[PDB]
Amino acid sequence: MERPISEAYFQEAKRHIPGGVSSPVRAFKAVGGTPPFLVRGEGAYVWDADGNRYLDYVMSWGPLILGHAHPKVLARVRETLERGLTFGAPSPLEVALAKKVKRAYPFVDLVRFVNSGTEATMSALRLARGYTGRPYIVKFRGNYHGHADGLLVEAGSGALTLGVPSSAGVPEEYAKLTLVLEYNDPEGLREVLKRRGEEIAAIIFEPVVGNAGVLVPTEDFLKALHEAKAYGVLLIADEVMTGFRLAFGGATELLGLKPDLVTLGKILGGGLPAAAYAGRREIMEKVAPLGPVYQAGTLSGNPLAMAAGLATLELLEENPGYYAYLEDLGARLEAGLKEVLKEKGLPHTVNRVGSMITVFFTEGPVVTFQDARRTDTELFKRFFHGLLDRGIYWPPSNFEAAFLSVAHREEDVEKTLEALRKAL
Amino acid sequence: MERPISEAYFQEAKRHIPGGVSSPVRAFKAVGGTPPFLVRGEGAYVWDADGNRYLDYVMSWGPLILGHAHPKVLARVRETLERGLTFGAPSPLEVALAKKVKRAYPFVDLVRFVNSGTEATMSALRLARGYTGRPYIVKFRGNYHGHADGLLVEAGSGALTLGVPSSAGVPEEYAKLTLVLEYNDPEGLREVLKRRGEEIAAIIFEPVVGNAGVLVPTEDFLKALHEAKAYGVLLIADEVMTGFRLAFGGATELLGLKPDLVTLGKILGGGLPAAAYAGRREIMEKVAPLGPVYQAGTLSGNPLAMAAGLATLELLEENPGYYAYLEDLGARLEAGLKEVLKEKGLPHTVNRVGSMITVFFTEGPVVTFQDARRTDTELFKRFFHGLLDRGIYWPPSNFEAAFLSVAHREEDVEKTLEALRKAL
């Protein structure tokens, strides 16, 4: 496939933007080559600057469950923009979206909108610390909640669970209050609670991991997570990716979780920047202007984003069948991928939950981040480029979940399987 | 003025959103009363849910220098949205906006877009630490750069310059690497540099303060700031509010600053969420995917925001006369405010730079944050509500800069002065 115009844009972009991109992964470093510059999308398809059409499995990383440019969503944004792009004051739209969130998450009383997942998780952790008065927070390996300095940590090689800076520019002082545990390791979690559960303000986690590729929580891991609540620890379900996707009520609904706080985003904004943190009133009332935990956002609750999100959530709430459709299409893609890869004699493990799926190139099962790191990234490159050259746009990294949208059809899955049979 | 519908919305909002708002100041706590729910804007005017029209001096806190719903800006957004709301991949629009930023800021080589000012400053400080390898950063009293935990600090009462948490949920560990100095205190700054300039990674500051009301930097303070550069300290000009406003090249152009990094926002997005951090290549190349300083943003560089910002910056670059117009209108408002307040025998100090203005109710001059805190907030309430009841929407806090837009006219200023003559 030729993409001379994207090549020219990438070379030019590098002269004005670090690495030519606004976010690392978009640079294709993990797979090599030049990333296509996307300029248009419709349903499950996207077009690059050279006119090449691709079946899109990235879908802007999660917000597009209804597909690219859904007519109803765009109509709502069109109407809203005519009145003005921003006001910096209360809006009826914010109240409407907050109520929708509360319908999806019954345990929630109050919702605070912010501009990004990074801001949502940063605020939620601060809120947990403020509410409990405790200093420590727990995060799991392979999970990503944004780039707040205290979260840019990795496990240290010694007996301490304190994290160590995983990025330059992050002082040890900012990393020492974050404990790093292994995902799907209930024994390790129960042990940390026994050691110092009473000084941990919160445990944040992706209900179904996507940022290390898909990792599904075991029944016992979920049990241990809720056991932390007895220690006074606040459970924070980071549903920025799973929210409104695995079900209307996200992973919380699907898995029957009982979190103290939930962070939301992506689908929440229907394609435009929007995120939030929410929970019961006794915790949320600590947030300014009600309480001492400070958090602000000048352009938060943007009219267009609220409108796009409202139109999106209304459609999902109006069509519960969309989730069953995604589950069936996802089941077909998973079975198909296993069949094709088995026929090719390639080592593989396909993890999927609803519309989120990842192909790991290593013998199964893949349960922890350690397991995930065993994936053969060289084989992934072959898998990735084989698909891209045949008009199929998959996440440019093995440590990412691919996404299905209601716009994807059975024939799209079949074309994907066929492309693989010929590529590998 | 009656606003029964906004009253109903505010009561309902409080049931679903903390304090009924997405950002503290919008709750009117500093002035009392119910905040009007704004639903439409055009030029220098806005309308609330009850149909009341107001001359707008808030202008969504800075992005609307061209006024509400500028036709050319909306047209660009309309065109862009039809192609899709987000892609999560490189876009020609990002490259275009980055180039525009580089025209406004000649010293810049690379620009990285993020979703909010909070993310921009958080990233820039991390970048400075990564580049220098130093742990400490300096911020000034009254200056606000976002709610990153390390910035949520206030001066301590003792001899240490280390900040102390000013919000609940912020551990002492996160506050101890931020030094808090007084704005416009060159002697204090020179002293800190002598004490430990070699372990300070950066000094961040608002070139012209707005978040404590308008504070103008003295020639000597600006001199001391640049003197820090000789110590290896990176100078970070936070131009989220002043950028593209005081001049096309912001305060950097107006005051002839020589920063190492600049943070941008508000006007940069033309009304939609968008921000950035930028500087020369030797520093910016430390950012991922080029370097070890990590920062990401899934929905950064949103198509609609890039389009709105591009249309906005093109107009400003095409019309240098807009800045002279704002200066003249601002001069008229400042002179008028002094005249009216002097006639009323009220203590006052009016600070202004271009289109940014604040009325402090205390005898002048107001140079430091300490000076600013002397303002009579009770009198401000009278000033605020007197204006609001007469259709003039001023920032609902004395510690805020009011904004003029190219859409404001001489007659609007006169109506403001008249409203005050009758209100006070």
Ligand SMILES: Cc1ncc(COP(=O)(O)O)c(CN)c1O
């Ligand atoms: C679960 C989760 N939380 C937070 C984020 C960060 O979202 P954002 O980049 O808009 O801050 C992401 C995106 N990788 C995510 O997947």
Ligand SMILES: Cc1ncc(COP(=O)(O)O)c(CN)c1O
């Ligand atoms: C100079 C400056 N920097 C950063 C910010 C924060 O912008 P945001 O709320 O979009 O993160 C503000 C808004 N008060 C600001 O005035």
Ligand code: NA
């Ligand atoms: Na360790």
Ligand code: NA
């Ligand atoms: Na990842």
Ligand code: NA
């Ligand atoms: Na002190």
Ligand code: NA
């Ligand atoms: Na302020």
